[PDB]
Structure 1
Amino acid sequence: RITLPPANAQRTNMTCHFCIVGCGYHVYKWPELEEGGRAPEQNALGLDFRKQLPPLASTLTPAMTNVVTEHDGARYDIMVVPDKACVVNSGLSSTRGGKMASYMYTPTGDGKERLSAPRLYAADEWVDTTWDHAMALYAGLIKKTLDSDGPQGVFFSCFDHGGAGGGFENTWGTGKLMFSAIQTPMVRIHNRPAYNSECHATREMGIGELNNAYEDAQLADVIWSIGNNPYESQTNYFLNHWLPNLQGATTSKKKERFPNENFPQARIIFVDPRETPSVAIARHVAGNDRVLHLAIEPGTDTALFNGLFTYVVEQGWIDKPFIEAHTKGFDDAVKTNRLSLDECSNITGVPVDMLKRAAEWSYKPKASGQAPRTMHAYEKGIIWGNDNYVIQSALLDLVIATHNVGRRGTGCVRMGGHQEGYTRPPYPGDKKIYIDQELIKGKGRIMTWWGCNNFQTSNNAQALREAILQRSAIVKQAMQKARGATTEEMVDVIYEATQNGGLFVTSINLYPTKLAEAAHLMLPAAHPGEMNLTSMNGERRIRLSEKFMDPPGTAMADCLIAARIANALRDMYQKDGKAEMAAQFEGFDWKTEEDAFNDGFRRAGQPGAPAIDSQGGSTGHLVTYDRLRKSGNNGVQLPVVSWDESKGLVGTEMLYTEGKFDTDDGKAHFKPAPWNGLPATVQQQKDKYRFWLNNGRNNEVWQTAYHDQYNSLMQERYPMAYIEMNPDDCKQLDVTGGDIVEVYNDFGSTFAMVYPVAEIKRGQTFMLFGYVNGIQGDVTTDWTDRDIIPYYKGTWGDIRKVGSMSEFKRTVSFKSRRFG
């Protein structure tokens, strides 16, 4: 049964907390026990519940509702449903966003284990403490470290993304604290071990990675999905924009926009060693003849694109006038990346006929005279691939020569992971530092994981965990030995321990997480809805998620936790008589997250403002919470061009439409893309072990499963990370669905429940990454590219049968996840 919201129910806008797509939702809140009527005008949904609703009329299930308990003790019904008018999702909800209501905090629901107060490890367990105590210990340590060791003694691993656990307010808060106040260069990002970018090459070439609109996917003649599984990882972008194009429903838009131009039925090309659910669905919708799955050899992307690039050049299927006027370095790239289709096929394993077909569909001039409009989408298949920097250098050269950026219906873009929401001071260092190694080598007095869980997501994670757990045990023994000490004496005792190999560990999260195994202190954070939060999606569409409820206990917004830390440090120094030190911690006089939005995002590029790097750019000041709220879930695509009362916030649909790029001379820059084969470190495991250890996303599971681990249905579906294996390989190992296998190489060991998948190639596998029961990262190597970007997708190991788990066989379905 479901309780309808009265027609006057409070309604707020909410962007999905999770993926890059950033689907629009509405949140209905009204007193518990108050019920709307079944007649359409009698409920906030305006739907007729007196009789069966027709198909597609609504997305509403019990999991999309809940009853929260506010700080004043009042209980309220809440309902979180997708917004039919949002152009992003057109009313669609993915299985992840659909659970938002179930994952909102309540003392009896899936989120009852949220952190409601600062927690402290004492007496060999966790106990609640107060913010004053927590800050006394936390600021105390950071203060002693700063006075004795300087900033290099303070380590952080922090989110730099958007959506829940990120956002323009939260990244500015943490960044200002980390970089401007503390000034520590010892910081890594949530998904990468150093302070770097996943897109150094494309950016240096003049092309920021989010250069088009989701509508461009509807206007494309051809769509490439490179190292990407869109139906599972960017669901509604794939469903609301990609598929309608393949189904022929966007032809009228193409016709209206482009005169004197043929529009062949849309086609899609996947560059992925693995046959995924996305491939299968694309074939189910457009037919096999319109889908090209270039099932390349793992890590051979650079060879593929160099071959295509060489070929389009030889065929003349390039935009010469464009290359001539808006690019630099074309002739050099033709020489350095030369590779014949036969050589390409030899290296990639992709038939020459298919290589030719892909190029013909994508770059050969249409009968009407125009080059096809081809959108190149890519994600972690090549970002965490064999040399991040080189693959993008190879791919972008292909895109640039074929003018596939700047033309509607095209673009070479990341598909994204989390939403974006970056506003920060510049990184305070001149060198890239691999943080995990420094910690393993014993550097640092205090480490703070903020909005991330590297125990489940770092590359070569087993080495990190063993090291952190060891350095943490040292501080634990010291703290336990000093039971009864004052907070000040305890800070000294802890500091001494870190001078003897110890490491004080703090986690600022929504839950304890695996990090609770090593942490000494944990601070309660708040997610969207418990706070206001701004972020943009894959087409740079910024929206405001509105607060509609109180955070659990004393939890608070990350940008505010940052201010709380900064003010406690400022006050501690004032009391210590150190005026200059106290002064560097001023600037966090904030009462709500909106104050951070004003201090960072809106001051970017303005007179008298500090150096700020913001995705909002220098016109970010035009954005305000009131204007965003008025813009609804459609918000505005950055960068904002202007604002007026009549039209509101006016933005930018696609970048680079004039052929001007983000470089010194305004031209796109071609780069050399040398094919070196796999890295030695990776090749060594491949020469020593049998299976390629592919890894990644599962449609239903969101990241480290921080919420999912508490959901009954998710627990019953995936009680352990799973590994997709070819049936012949399973027969040889004598395992079937639900059996547990050990996976291992020289970097570590892990385990998973066997998932027989006919589509998996023999000698290859796919394992759910970053899980709570079976950590795939333990078998990933320490190899990273020139900017320290890990080849998370490049590892090999052996697999042996451990045993059977009857419960897994009783509850877990092992039927195919490939539709059709």
Structure 2
Amino acid sequence: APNDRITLPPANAQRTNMTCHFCIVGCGYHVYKWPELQEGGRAPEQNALGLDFRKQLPPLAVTLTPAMTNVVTEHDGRRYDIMVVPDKACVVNSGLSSTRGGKMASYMYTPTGDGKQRLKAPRLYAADQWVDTTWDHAMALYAGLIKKTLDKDGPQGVFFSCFDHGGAGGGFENTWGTGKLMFSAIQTPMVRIHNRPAYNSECHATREMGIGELNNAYEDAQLADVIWSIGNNPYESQTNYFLNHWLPNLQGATTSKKKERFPNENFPQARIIFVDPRETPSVAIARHVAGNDRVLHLAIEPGTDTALFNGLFTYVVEQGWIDKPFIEAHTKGFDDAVKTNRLSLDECSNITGVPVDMLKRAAEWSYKPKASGQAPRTMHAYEKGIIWGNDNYVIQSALLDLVIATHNVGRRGTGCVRMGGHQEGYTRPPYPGDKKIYIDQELIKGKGRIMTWWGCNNFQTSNNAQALREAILQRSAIVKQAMQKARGATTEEMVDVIYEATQNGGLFVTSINLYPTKLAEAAHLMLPAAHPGEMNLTSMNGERRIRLSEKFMDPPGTAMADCLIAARIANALRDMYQKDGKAEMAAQFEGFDWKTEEDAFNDGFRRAGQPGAPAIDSQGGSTGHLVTYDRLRKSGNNGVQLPVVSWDESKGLVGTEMLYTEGKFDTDDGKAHFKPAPWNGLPATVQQQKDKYRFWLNNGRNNEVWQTAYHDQYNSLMQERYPMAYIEMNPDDCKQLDVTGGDIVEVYNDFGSTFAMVYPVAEIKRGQTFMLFGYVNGIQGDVTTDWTDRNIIPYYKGTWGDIRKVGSMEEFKRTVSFKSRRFA
């Protein structure tokens, strides 16, 4: 509207707590809500911010822009100003807002705003057109098909791809509701996860070695001597962890606190090491902050992490830069790992391409004893460069071996941790099968009667995405064609028509979402969901800090919390089985008598490990029952780090800062277990693409864009900046292909074809590229392979392809900046 003023919140405005919807860090925010025709005064005591708008504010006093404001229209028709701004007193972010969280106000639902296209009612593709339908009809069709599939094929005929994460489109209520429905009620094993094509973990190896992947506090980043960032671009992907914790360390602002905790320990200037094939904005910003001499960029060859960590491990062992008393008292398998993982520096250097001097320096900074005698406190942070790297399981084996031998778990200022993606919020029954199933391959091969995508969009984010879409669109078409012949059918007849089409290659597709998305190209049924602020939601961040996001506004139309969508389906299925006189099947669908999301929190998180409870896997553990909504409210955006250790009315929730500080690991014997980590090169499937084609097709995040851009696609600023997925290319490579910024290219290989706009980047190595993943205009995943590790973890960062000029998009040249995103 007017772009040159904002409406201040009144002194008495309602204020609620909200955790950022988006990334792992889980920054704290406040939501101010007040009637549209009121406003605060500029004097500091006459507005809810307590800030003096009678004269210019100084730097750091506030984060406030029009994008952080909105006007909602509630179900009663009344209009309210909202303002969603970062909490200065939250420990996580200390009043920081990323560009992503900063837009939350704009991405709340309003009838005319960026959320205008939110799903408001059930949508049905009635054979040849999109129409609205009732919830009752939708449930009759969806539960009717599930029931028919259960009755004739059993659970193996009902497929899901569902979120398992926290924050918006996840969290403890929602993961329990969906997991109870899929696993305890329907009892299907045909379930994959939003980011990976089977029911598995990103962290099998570290878990099996006894080290759960979120084992420290954000404060540990402040206390470290050295931080490793492995397969990780944290300024862009975990912004406020990097900004509020890492950088203060590099700047010297935490030195006092280290020295206060450890009186007889030297603390040199902190340093940072990045293991990343690509020179990222994170590397550039670290060098601007700390200087070139305190940053090591180990620009490894794609896929060579295992060789790197085996060379480092070998070296620190030969140097004696390990903790022998620690190994002897608290570990198993060391002697074996020394032999299996042996690799010289020279061999390491040849495979990784990192010079020997740099391998030695990384080891010197990180593991060689300080003058005062203690080992450096070296926090090892890693993310998708190695989780989606060359053999997830083996890389983690290699890394954790180095970490364990050097005692970099369980000491303050250390940890070998995931940086995280989404926030975490997992409470589920056990997976009901005994094998890992590659769901996408099964669908491509023609299995399944019904597939539900639930708070994900694998059209944009599957590995080998082109194969997936081809198949799903075709299978979807069979069902649409069958529906076409119907006229005047009952719901029960239509269920029969669709079921028969699925015996002929068809697949009924449902999407449970905020938005239509690309899934609308194949879906027959879409159901409207609610996000945080339209519901209460609990989740935890990368240091296990659980918070409550408070409901403050109504959802669009009849949109519902995902846990209540799950209850709705369960209760429909129960009624159908009751009506068919099948008491035993009906009973499988008990336990969803839920009126509000809090019911799901009580039934799941708060029952875990309790007497007479079913088996429940929960990140809250067996003290989860000590957390209630009311107690979380009293904690504020500081919440509690899980697991909770005690609670009483006078001291509130008290939790756990760092894991493993007594040297008891999560194994049978309480020791940490070393593992062999063989170097086998690239997988043959990937090596064949590399042999045939010119460019390494690296892929991942951009700071400004969130995920599949489900909100950002409607944001005019976002679309003006990034109208099309971009591909960073070396300028010399660009000149060879006669392309420059704003040209469009085709990117292709044996797995597929996609498009991108060219973004010349001086820092990209010749023969390498970097494409934005997951986007709405040019899907990167078309050119990823089908290859996965032993646990069906994809090598999403492992693919090669060729690049062909399409043409110059003059409009992009006129409107998009192709200037450097690496700050100097």
The alpha carbon displacement at 1:605 in A equals 0.2
Q: Distance in 2 between matches of 1:475 and 1:123?
A: 8
Q: Distance in 1 between matches of 2:773 and 2:552?
A: 33
Q: Distance in 1 between matches of 2:445 and 2:342?
A: 42
Indicate the SS of the match to 1:211: coil
Indicate the SS of the match to 1:368: coil
Q: Which 4+ stretches in 1 moved above 3 angstroms?
A: none
Q: Distance in 2 between matches of 1:238 and 1:136?
A: 49
Partner of 1:700: 704
CA deviations on 1:39-77 (whole Å, 9 max, x unpaired) are: 111111111111111111100000000000000001010
The alpha carbon displacement at 1:578 in A equals 1.4
Indicate the SS of the match to 2:107: coil
The alpha carbon displacement at 1:454 in A equals 0.2
CA deviations on 1:674-713 (whole Å, 9 max, x unpaired) are: 0000000000000010000000000000000000000001
Q: Distance in 1 between matches of 2:109 and 2:127?
A: 28
Partner of 1:49: 53
Indicate the SS of the match to 1:273: coil
CA deviations on 1:538-563 (whole Å, 9 max, x unpaired) are: 00000000000000000000000000
Q: Distance in 1 between matches of 2:238 and 2:658?
A: 19
Match of 2:254 among 250, 257, 276: 250
Match of 2:428 among 424, 428, 431: 424
Does structure 1 retain, via aligned residues, the 8 Å contact 2:127–2:481?
no
CA deviations on 1:6-36 (whole Å, 9 max, x unpaired) are: 1111100000000000000000001101111
Partner of 2:566: 562
Indicate the SS of the match to 2:105: coil
Match of 1:346 among 344, 350, 360: 350
The alpha carbon displacement at 1:138 in A equals 0.6
Indicate the SS of the match to 2:34: strand
Does residue 85 in structure 1 map to residue 89 in structure 2?
yes
The alpha carbon displacement at 1:575 in A equals 1.4
Partner of 1:37: 41
Q: Distance in 1 between matches of 2:504 and 2:366?
A: 61
Q: Distance in 2 between matches of 1:314 and 1:483?
A: 78
Does residue 326 in structure 1 map to residue 363 in structure 2?
no
Indicate the SS of the match to 1:25: strand
Indicate the SS of the match to 2:336: helix
Indicate the SS of the match to 1:111: coil
Q: Distance in 2 between matches of 1:499 and 1:124?
A: 21
Q: Distance in 2 between matches of 1:576 and 1:326?
A: 58
Indicate the SS of the match to 1:293: strand
Deviates more, 1:32-41 or 1:446-455: 32-41
Deviates more, 1:787-796 or 1:797-806: 797-806
CA deviations on 1:727-773 (whole Å, 9 max, x unpaired) are: 00000000000000111110000110000000000000000000011
Q: Distance in 2 between matches of 1:252 and 1:127?
A: 64
The alpha carbon displacement at 1:481 in A equals 1.4
Q: Distance in 2 between matches of 1:88 and 1:647?
A: 21
Q: Distance in 2 between matches of 1:662 and 1:125?
A: 54
Q: Distance in 2 between matches of 1:16 and 1:52?
A: 28
Does residue 528 in structure 1 map to residue 503 in structure 2?
no
The alpha carbon displacement at 1:406 in A equals 0.3
Q: Distance in 1 between matches of 2:581 and 2:110?
A: 44
CA deviations on 1:228-252 (whole Å, 9 max, x unpaired) are: 0000000000000000000000001
Q: Distance in 2 between matches of 1:436 and 1:545?
A: 34
The alpha carbon displacement at 1:612 in A equals 0.2
The alpha carbon displacement at 1:123 in A equals 5.7
CA deviations on 1:208-237 (whole Å, 9 max, x unpaired) are: 000000000000000000000000000000
Q: Distance in 1 between matches of 2:290 and 2:7?
A: 40
CA deviations on 1:765-794 (whole Å, 9 max, x unpaired) are: 000000011010000000000000000000
Indicate the SS of the match to 1:649: strand
Partner of 1:180: 184
Does structure 1 retain, via aligned residues, the 8 Å contact 2:278–2:299?
yes
Indicate the SS of the match to 1:102: helix
CA deviations on 1:603-650 (whole Å, 9 max, x unpaired) are: 000000000000000000000000000000000000000001111000
Q: Distance in 2 between matches of 1:740 and 1:501?
A: 36
Q: Distance in 1 between matches of 2:295 and 2:448?
A: 51
Partner of 1:385: 389
The alpha carbon displacement at 1:494 in A equals 0.6
CA deviations on 1:78-98 (whole Å, 9 max, x unpaired) are: 000000000000000000000
Q: Distance in 2 between matches of 1:235 and 1:127?
A: 41
Q: Distance in 2 between matches of 1:195 and 1:653?
A: 29
Q: Distance in 2 between matches of 1:34 and 1:491?
A: 52
Q: Distance in 1 between matches of 2:318 and 2:173?
A: 50
Does structure 1 retain, via aligned residues, the 8 Å contact 2:127–2:480?
no
CA deviations on 1:97-143 (whole Å, 9 max, x unpaired) are: 00000000000000000000011112633211110011010111001
CA deviations on 1:360-408 (whole Å, 9 max, x unpaired) are: 0000000001000000000000000000000000000000000000000
Deviates more, 1:732-741 or 1:571-580: 571-580
Indicate the SS of the match to 1:120: strand
The alpha carbon displacement at 1:37 in A equals 1.1
Does residue 457 in structure 1 map to residue 444 in structure 2?
no
Partner of 1:472: 476
The alpha carbon displacement at 1:804 in A equals 1.1
**TM-score, normalised by the number of residues in structure 1:** 1.00
Identity of aligned residues (%): 99
Partner of 1:583: 587
CA deviations on 1:267-326 (whole Å, 9 max, x unpaired) are: 000000000000000000000000000000000000000000000000000000000000
Deviates more, 1:123-132 or 1:283-292: 123-132
RMSD: 0.5
Indicate the SS of the match to 1:809: helix
Q: Distance in 2 between matches of 1:360 and 1:502?
A: 60
Partner of 1:759: 763
CA deviations on 1:346-372 (whole Å, 9 max, x unpaired) are: 000000000000000000000001000
Q: Distance in 2 between matches of 1:50 and 1:742?
A: 54
The alpha carbon displacement at 1:576 in A equals 1.5
CA deviations on 1:173-225 (whole Å, 9 max, x unpaired) are: 00000000000000000000000000000000000000000000000000000
Match of 1:272 among 267, 273, 276: 276
Does structure 1 retain, via aligned residues, the 8 Å contact 2:608–2:618?
yes
Does structure 1 retain, via aligned residues, the 8 Å contact 2:127–2:483?
no
| Count of aligned positions | 820
Q: Distance in 2 between matches of 1:356 and 1:583?
A: 63
Does residue 672 in structure 1 map to residue 676 in structure 2?
yes
Indicate the SS of the match to 1:695: strand
Q: Distance in 1 between matches of 2:810 and 2:97?
A: 34
Deviates more, 1:577-586 or 1:352-361: 577-586
Q: Distance in 1 between matches of 2:572 and 2:422?
A: 31
The alpha carbon displacement at 1:583 in A equals 1.2
Partner of 2:633: 629
Q: Distance in 2 between matches of 1:428 and 1:339?
A: 41
Indicate the SS of the match to 1:502: coil
Indicate the SS of the match to 1:456: helix
How do 1:369-408 residues align onto structure 2 when only pairs under 5 Å count? 369-408=373-412
The alpha carbon displacement at 1:256 in A equals 0.9
The alpha carbon displacement at 1:420 in A equals 0.2
The alpha carbon displacement at 1:3 in A equals 0.5
The alpha carbon displacement at 1:449 in A equals 0.2
Indicate the SS of the match to 2:228: strand
Q: Distance in 2 between matches of 1:377 and 1:483?
A: 59
Indicate the SS of the match to 2:805: strand
CA deviations on 1:131-177 (whole Å, 9 max, x unpaired) are: 00110101110010110111000000000000000000000000000
The alpha carbon displacement at 1:483 in A equals 3.2
Indicate the SS of the match to 1:800: strand
Q: Distance in 2 between matches of 1:224 and 1:259?
A: 25
Indicate the SS of the match to 1:101: helix
Indicate the SS of the match to 1:127: strand
- Unaligned 5+ runs, structure 1: none
Does residue 217 in structure 1 map to residue 205 in structure 2?
no
Q: Distance in 2 between matches of 1:585 and 1:203?
A: 32
Indicate the SS of the match to 2:244: helix
Q: Distance in 2 between matches of 1:577 and 1:389?
A: 48
Indicate the SS of the match to 2:218: coil
Deviates more, 1:572-581 or 1:265-274: 572-581
